[PDB]
Amino acid sequence: YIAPNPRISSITLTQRITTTGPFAILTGSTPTAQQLNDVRKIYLALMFPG
């Protein structure tokens, strides 16, 4: 599982640090052991569509 470049969210999601929002909180969060297992459970259902 490949993360994107970390300079993408740093020039366009947290450009102004005076404010916060719903997106600007979630960037500083890491997946747990089971919340990564749900991402593995997402991509199984994208490959077998119906």
């Binding site: 600007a24 909180i25 500083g28 969060s29 890491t30």
Partner: peptide, 23 residues
Amino acid sequence: EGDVLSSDSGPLLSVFALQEIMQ
């Protein structure tokens, strides 16, 4: 008590969830 700590670089956004270990 019972607090945990890991390697984090988000100074604001992860310590919000650190009080969730307190509460």
